Amino acid sequence: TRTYDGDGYKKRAACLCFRSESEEEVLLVSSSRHPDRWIVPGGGMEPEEEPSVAAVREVCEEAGVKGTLGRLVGIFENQERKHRTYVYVLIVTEVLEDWEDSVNIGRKREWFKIEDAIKVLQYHKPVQASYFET
Ligand SMILES: O=P(O)(O)O[C@@H]1[C@@H](OP(=O)(O)OP(=O)(O)O)[C@H](OP(=O)(O)O)[C@@H](OP(=O)(O)O)[C@@H](O)[C@H]1OP(=O)(O)O
Ligand SMILES: [Cl-]
Ligand SMILES: [F-]
Ligand SMILES: [Mg+2]
Ligand SMILES: [Mg+2]
Ligand SMILES: [Mg+2]
């Protein structure tokens, strides 16, 4: 069940899944629409779902990882696609082998140095590139 802010924007949450507290490498996942493209794992908040709970859930589902939830980076709107995404930092402590999207749609995951994550998101996901700006 998709959920929405009062202005009709889809509510979403995502994590910047860092390899360590140094925040030098981040985990991206393959796009479901176009698997040759990278995205920040994330998705829809469920009804009455806390943003930080949605964020942690979606990354488990999409990236097959778990860890220590960190700070909220900010809230990011995609005017074109009408969504508003809460973005949190998650320091990965568990990397799991056969996660929901690997099983169901063969979703891929890869570590990127931050500067490279920004590069591969720029073309199709400029708002997700902006998650890294601060
Ligand atoms: O399939 P996902 O989870 O990776 O993400 C998809 C969105 O799913 P999202 O990550 O928001 O939700 P969830 O399915 O909960 O992860 C979906 O959003 P939706 O509109 O709800 O179908 C969106 O559609 P858009 O809003 O029309 O841009 C795109 O299909 C997007 O595909 P991707 O970025 O190419 O992987
Ligand atoms: Cl790191
Ligand atoms: F999802
Ligand atoms: Mg999802
Ligand atoms: Mg998603
Ligand atoms: Mg979902």
Give residue limits of the domains in the chain: 1-134
| Residues with CB in 5 Å of ion ligand 3 | 43
- Sign of the C-alpha dihedral, residues 96, 98, 99, 102? positive
Q: What is the number of alpha carbons within 13 Å of residue 16 lying toward its C-beta?
A: 29
Rounded Cα distance between 72 and 15, Å, is 9
* Ligand 1 neighbourhood includes 70 CB (under 6 angstroms): no
Quick one: tokens of 7? 């202005």
71: which 2 tokens? 């700070």
Structure token digits, residue 4: 């929405």
Instruction: Give the Cα separation of 45 and 34 in Å (integer).
Output: 23
Experimental technique for the deposited model: X-ray
CA 106-64-18 angle, 5° bins: 120
31 marked among binding-site residues: yes
User: How many A from CA of 44 to the centre of ligand 5?
Assistant: 7
Of the candidates 32, 13, 11, the one whose C-alpha atom is nearest the C-alpha of residue 83 is 11
Centre of ligand 4 to C-alpha 91, Å, is 19
Establish whether residue 2 lines the binding site of ligand 1, counting it when its CB lies within 6 angstroms of any ligand atom: yes
Tokens 């959920």 sit at which residue?
3
Tokens 């507290």 appear where?
21
Ligand 1 contact via 82 beta carbon (within 6 Å): no
What is the spatial distance between Cα 125 and Cα 22, in angstroms, rounded to a whole number? 24
**Structure tokens, 123:** 């073309």
Catalytic residues: 61
What's the CA-to-centroid distance between 79 and ligand 1, angstroms? 15
Encoded tokens for 87: 């973005």
- Under 8 Å between Cβ of 90 and 98: no
- Rounded to an integer, what distance in angstroms lies between the CA atom of residue 102 and that of residue 110? 13
Q: Is 106 left (phi over 0), alpha (psi -120 to 50) or beta?
A: left
d(CA 103, CA 107): 8
- SS3 state at 6: coil
Instruction: Give Cα 66 to chain centroid, integer Å.
Output: 13
Collapsing DSSP states into helix, strand and coil, what is residue 15? Answer: strand
